[PDB]
């Protein structure tokens, strides 16, 4: 993850079905905020062959290095709207 607000990379994060639109996530040490475009937050919840889940697009905020006392994001049930993501690299 390139942790700079001016990155041109957006990260998709997954959450439990029925989550509120998760606003800020500490992802791999980088604080990310939900993206918003002309049509609203770039967020949707789905119920299909991939199960019941929600997804959002996220980019780093300006302020980095804050260590918040937040819960882990819920990837199955409704997540808190500020949470620490349970990320792990591929084959690790």
């Amino acid at each position: 993850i390139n942790c700079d607000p001016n990155t041109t990379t957006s990260h998709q994060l997954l959450f439990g079905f029925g989550s509120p639109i998760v606003q800020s996530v500490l992802f791999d040490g980088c604080m990310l905020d939900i993206e918003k475009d002309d049509y609203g937050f770039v967020w949707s919840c789905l119920s299909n062959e991939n199960g019941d889940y929600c997804k959002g697009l996220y980019k780093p905020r300006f302020t980095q290095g804050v260590s918040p006392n937040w819960p882990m994001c819920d990837l199955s049930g409704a997540s808190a709207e500020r949470c620490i993501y349970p990320y792990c690299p591929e084959g690790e």
Binding site: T8, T9, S44, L46, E49, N50
Partner: protein, 102 residues
């Protein structure tokens, strides 16, 4: 490993690349200002069951308004298909450059 396999992988990357580009195009909101414009992106995909979901999208270059529409369009794709039992192809498909146009 061998030249024949390299040919197959190159062919499959082209085929799935086209599938992915079509999936994005189907979700893309059409605007007149996009005429003759392009957005070049990189997709990082995460294998999920039999297919793949979006991991990250990097906007490389292109028309600013079309690139914004492309981001939403990519975010709206339900799933990206992957070949069964072709791990070498999957490796290339998980990190793929695409050109999106209306």
């Amino acid at each position: 490993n061998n030249a024949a396999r390299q040919q197959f992988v190159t062919s499959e990357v082209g085929r799935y690349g086209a599938i992915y580009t079509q999936l994005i195009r189907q979700n893309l909101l059409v605007e007149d200002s996009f005429r003759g414009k392009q957005c070049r992106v990189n997709l990082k995909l995460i294998p999920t069951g039999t297919g793949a979901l979006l991991g990250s999208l990097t906007v490389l270059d292109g028309d600013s308004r079309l690139c914004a529409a492309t981001k939403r369009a990519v975010a709206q794709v339900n799933s990206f298909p992957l070949p069964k039992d072709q791990p070498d192809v999957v490796e290339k498909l998980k990190n793929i450059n695409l050109t999106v146009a209306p």
